[PDB]
Amino acid sequence: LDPGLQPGNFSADEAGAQLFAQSYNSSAEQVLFQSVAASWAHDTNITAENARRQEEAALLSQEFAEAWGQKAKELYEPIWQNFTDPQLRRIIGAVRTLGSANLPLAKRQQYNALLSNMSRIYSTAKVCLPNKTATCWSLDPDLTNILASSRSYAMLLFAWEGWHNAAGIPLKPLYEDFTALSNEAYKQDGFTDTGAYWRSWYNSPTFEDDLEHLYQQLEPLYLNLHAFVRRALHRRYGDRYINLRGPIPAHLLGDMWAQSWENIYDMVVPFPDKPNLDVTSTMLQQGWNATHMFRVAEEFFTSLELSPMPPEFWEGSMLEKPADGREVVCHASAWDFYNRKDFRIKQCTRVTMDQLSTVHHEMGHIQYYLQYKDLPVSLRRGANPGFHEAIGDVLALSVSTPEHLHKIGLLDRVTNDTESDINYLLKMALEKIAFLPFGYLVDQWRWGVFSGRTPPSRYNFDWWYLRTKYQGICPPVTRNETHFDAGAKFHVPNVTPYIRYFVSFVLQFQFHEALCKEAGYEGPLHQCDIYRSTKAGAKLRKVLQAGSSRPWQEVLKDMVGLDALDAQPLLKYFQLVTQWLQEQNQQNGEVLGWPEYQWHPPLPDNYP
Ligand SMILES: *[C@@H]1O[C@H](CO[C@@H]2O[C@@H](C)[C@@H](O)[C@@H](O)[C@@H]2O)[C@@H](O[C@@H]2O[C@H](CO)[C@@H](O[C@@H]3O[C@H](CO[C@H]4O[C@H](CO)[C@@H](O)[C@H](O)[C@@H]4O[C@@H]4O[C@H](CO)[C@@H](O)[C@H](O)[C@H]4NC(C)=O)[C@@H](O)[C@H](O[C@H]4O[C@H](CO)[C@@H](O)[C@H](O)[C@@H]4O)[C@@H]3O)[C@H](O)[C@H]2NC(C)=O)[C@H](O)[C@H]1NC(C)=O
Ligand SMILES: *[C@@H]1O[C@H](CO)[C@@H](O[C@@H]2O[C@H](CO)[C@@H](O[C@@H]3O[C@H](CO[C@H]4O[C@H](CO)[C@@H](O)[C@H](O)[C@@H]4O[C@@H]4O[C@H](CO)[C@@H](O)[C@H](O)[C@H]4NC(C)=O)[C@@H](O)[C@H](O)[C@@H]3O)[C@H](O)[C@H]2NC(C)=O)[C@H](O)[C@H]1NC(C)=O
Ligand SMILES: *[C@@H]1O[C@H](CO)[C@@H](O[C@@H]2O[C@H](CO)[C@@H](O[C@@H]3O[C@H](CO)[C@@H](O)[C@H](O[C@H]4O[C@H](CO)[C@@H](O)[C@H](O)[C@@H]4O)[C@@H]3O)[C@H](O)[C@H]2NC(C)=O)[C@H](O)[C@H]1NC(C)=O
Ligand SMILES: *[C@@H]1O[C@H](CO)[C@@H](O[C@@H]2O[C@H](CO)[C@@H](O[C@@H]3O[C@H](CO)[C@@H](O)[C@H](O)[C@@H]3O)[C@H](O)[C@H]2NC(C)=O)[C@H](O)[C@H]1NC(C)=O
Ligand SMILES: *[C@@H]1O[C@H](CO)[C@@H](O[C@@H]2O[C@H](CO)[C@@H](O[C@@H]3O[C@H](CO)[C@@H](O)[C@H](O)[C@@H]3O)[C@H](O)[C@H]2NC(C)=O)[C@H](O)[C@H]1NC(C)=O
Ligand SMILES: *[C@@H]1O[C@H](CO)[C@@H](O[C@@H]2O[C@H](CO)[C@@H](O[C@@H]3O[C@H](CO)[C@@H](O)[C@H](O)[C@@H]3O)[C@H](O)[C@H]2NC(C)=O)[C@H](O)[C@H]1NC(C)=O
Ligand SMILES: *[C@@H]1O[C@H](CO)[C@@H](O[C@@H]2O[C@H](CO)[C@@H](O)[C@H](O)[C@H]2NC(C)=O)[C@H](O)[C@H]1NC(C)=O
Ligand SMILES: *[C@@H]1O[C@H](CO)[C@@H](O)[C@H](O)[C@H]1NC(C)=O
Ligand SMILES: [Zn+2]
């Protein structure tokens, strides 16, 4: 520990704690920058040297969070709740959280080693065909691509069976040990369990109830969608393997976790005679290039009179693919270095209509970072953890439209045909609405484990209960408590909350509606754009400047006017497809929901 990074002495006063907050701030951006710089380099190009620098940076960060966290508890754990500023209470409350650093070394060294071991066995999971094969598969590319692409039911089944079997089972013992150790650490931090810690972020005493009220508002839309898809699969696979009343076999939905079904959009799409618009042909013809695209993205924000990207951003960012042959993580990401001056993007840009949209949300994050850089570092995070991605997405929504592309000049004429825009809303529904029930059930399920209400003998039972209850899916081959299908997801062994994403996808439209309402727009909400609309920016800026200083429920209210989440705006956005599906279901006599829930298909005749 460098002494300039090691805390000093502070009194039990607020007057002291204000000085503690100030000292933590000044040290914090000096450590976090050094940490993120290393992590930036390692990700900007892989080298074992940079991986080492990445590893050392990780340790240096934790060592810093520890050295300060321990004193924050020692001096202010008896007090912090008392302090007059809600901003300061947030500052100290964050520092005062220690997480795993509560565990004594013996447990601590098991804990880290245990968490790493889960990620290893998941990331390095494998499935092998039932021969003396030279070669096995892995989740990507082999499994993701066969599962999405092929539709011979047996082959599709085996791929799903192998994965949840191989990925889950060897996790089963580890995940229990994680659960015990996880809760024990937070107990000392001040939470009943890890689950009550995660819910602490949303600072809402009624949080879990709020979700069910939201989800109940979605269920008519989701059931409408689910019931529609279910019929389509019946056309494809046969009466033996689908029940037009029952739930859907989990592996037919084109995705290993059935969390988003878009790979059956090719099978289901409405109005097969219409195209789906691709503006790439203009963009290449215009001589658009990656470097230019961001200037369009910046144009948008400048058009809202949000802040332009500072010169440092253009000096630093890796907008283009590198000139070297060096290996790089191409997946696009946006970075804030807590050093106030320089913000950074990595995009690996390929000039296509899709990545044009993608750049806009990635720059959206940068605009978000730019606005709250003025806060003390402890607060420089989204108003709540799903709130940051929402401000990212509302931007991509607007520009994805044909309407905005015409103001970009990339589109020649607007073509207001509902058959086309239904195609667009429906694919987006198969992407994101299918995700809401899944995103909801996981963190209910994990809260069930962390609260203990799902003891280890029920890990798998409570999972499939939650799947059929919410997502309308059931397992394709009988699954029993030797298995552990909850582990087969990325976010579970990586102990990463999904609930942020669900909160975000609701805040997304709850903003978009409140912006389009403010931008003077009227008409079909998916045809709104806010570009050039200074009225939207000045209100949006008020959200971004707040960062996390001000409780999100108060900030959301200042933007939208509602003290809480609501899915009515989301239903407004999807309204056109909502109507269309209701017609199509009513025409087919399709039974919304899934009675005969106690059904799942027989096995293929010679399996395998
Ligand atoms: C990615 O795309 C970027 C943008 O490309 C341009 O725009 C897009 C939409 C497409 O249409 C592209 O085809 C198009 O090229 C590229 O940056 C641009 O690169 C080109 C070529 O390298 C640049 O063109 C050259 O610019 C010189 C400077 O011209 C400006 O400055 C003069 C003073 O030096 C001034 O007198 C001019 O009026 C001009 O001012 C610009 O005005 C327009 C509006 O009228 C603004 O939009 C600009 O921002 C203004 N820029 C400034 C600095 O004020 C010219 O001297 C030069 O002409 C000479 O060279 C050409 C060959 O290049 C000869 O053919 C010609 O006869 C003459 O001798 C030429 O115009 C362009 O300026 C760059 N953009 C900017 C903003 O500077 C990226 O390089 C590209 N990257 C990749 C990898 O593709
Ligand atoms: C969390 O902790 C950070 C870091 O300690 C605090 O930032 C510092 O806050 C103070 C108060 O706002 C700020 O002082 C003001 O800075 C303005 C710019 O001052 C710069 O120029 C003068 C000369 O004109 C220098 O004397 C200063 O040291 C500054 O120097 C420049 O700083 C930038 C930014 O880091 C750096 O990139 C440049 O390299 C450097 N210049 C050169 C030539 O190298 C003044 O206009 C103003 O009047 C005040 O002096 C101080 O500069 C901040 N430092 C940094 C590193 O950010 C945060 O305030 C704190 N958080 C909160 C919420 O308070
Ligand atoms: C990924 O990005 C990083 C940052 O841009 C980039 O880092 C550089 O990589 C090169 C090798 O490709 C490093 O060069 C050597 O590093 C070794 C130690 O690992 C040194 O022994 C070498 O010393 C000589 O060179 C020095 C100047 O670099 C001289 O001052 C010295 O006297 C010796 O003559 C040499 O430094 C370089 O150090 C790193 N730098 C950093 C900051 O990482 C890396 O190249 C990129 N990846 C790829 C594949 O290009
Ligand atoms: C932060 O506050 C602490 C506690 O008020 C200060 O700690 C004290 O620091 C002095 C030196 O400034 C230490 O002196 C040592 O005392 C022992 C005898 O106990 C002697 O054998 C050593 O040779 C040395 O003189 C003292 O131990 C230490 N005491 C405590 C309780 O921490 C500290 O000075 C303050 N920080 C700063 C930067 O001033
Ligand atoms: C994380 O997983 C790894 C791998 O399962 C665990 O490391 C393994 O630990 C065992 C002993 O605990 C090692 O087996 C022993 O090896 C020695 C020879 O080194 C042998 O004499 C013993 O009879 C026994 O076979 C095993 O080699 C070791 N593997 C690796 C790769 O290190 C680790 O303990 C797990 N940690 C947690 C927290 O789960
Ligand atoms: C939960 O369901 C699984 C199947 O999905 C059951 O596990 C299976 O049980 C049978 C009977 O023991 C195993 O067959 C045996 O395999 C061994 C080779 O491993 C072979 O030598 C025997 O002759 C016999 O064929 C089968 O392999 C096994 N599968 C797995 C993946 O373990 C399990 O019994 C069910 N849970 C409970 C509590 O019964
Ligand atoms: C910190 O907590 C204490 C205890 O809840 C508060 O002290 C009490 O304050 C009320 C009025 O605010 C008095 O009627 C009590 O007599 C006080 N009790 C004691 C033991 O002093 C204190 O006000 C809180 N501080 C803040 C800033 O809210
Ligand atoms: C598209 O045409 C319909 C015609 O009824 C109209 O109601 C709708 O508002 C048009 N789109 C926009 C963005 O105005
Ligand atoms: Zn994002």
Numbering used by the authors: 1 to 608
Reproduce text from the manuscript describing this model.
The zinc metalloprotease angiotensin I‐converting enzyme (ACE;EC 3.4.15.1) is well‐known for its crucial role in blood pressure regulation and fluid homeostasis via the renin–angiotensin–aldosterone system (RAAS), where it catalyzes the hydrolysis of angiotensin I (Ang I) to the vasopressor angiotensin II (Ang II; Ehlers & Riordan, 1989). The somatic isoform of ACE (sACE) is a 1,277‐amino acid type‐I integral membrane protein with a short C‐terminal cytoplasmic tail. Each sACE molecule is composed of two homologous domains (N‐ and C‐domains) separated by a short linker region and each domain harbors a catalytic site with a HEMGH zinc‐binding motif (Wei, 1991). sACE is related to the carboxypeptidase ACE2 which, in addition to its role in the RAAS (Turner & Nalivaeva, 2022), acts as the functional receptor for the severe acute respiratory syndrome (SARS) coronavirus (Li et al, 2003) and SARS coronavirus 2 (SARS‐CoV‐2; Hoffmann et al, 2020). Here, we report the first cryo‐EM structures of full‐length, glycosylated, soluble sACE (sACES1211).
Although the C‐domains were unresolved due to high flexibility, the N‐domains resolved to a high resolution and allowed for the identification of the dimerization interface. B, C The local refinement map of the interacting N‐domains was resolved to a higher resolution, and the model showed wide active site clefts, and contact between the interdomain linker and subdomain II regions at the interface. The dimeric sACES1211 cryo‐EM structure shows a bridge formed between glycans on N82 of the two protomers. Apart from the glycan‐glycan bridge, the interface is further formed between residues of subdomain II of each N‐domain, specifically the helix of 456–471, Cloop‐2, and Cloop‐3. Equivalent interactions occur for both domains due to C2 symmetry. Residue Y465 is at the centre of the interface and forms hydrogen bonds to K469 and D462, and sandwich pi‐stacking with Y465. Y597 on Cloop‐3 interacts with F461 via T‐shaped pi‐stacking and hydrogen bonds with the N460 backbone carbonyl. However, the interface had an area of 1,054.76 Å2 and scored a favorable solvation free energy gain (ΔiG) of −7.29 kcal/mol upon formation of the complex (excluding the contribution of satisfied hydrogen bonds and salt bridges across the interface). Dimerization does not appear to cause large‐scale changes in the apo N‐domain conformation, since the monomer and dimer cryo‐EM N‐domain structures compare very well (0.65 Å RMSD). While the monomeric N‐domain showed zinc coordinated by H361 and H365, both dimer N‐domain active sites showed a rotamer flip of H361 away from the zinc, with metal coordination only via the H365 sidechain.
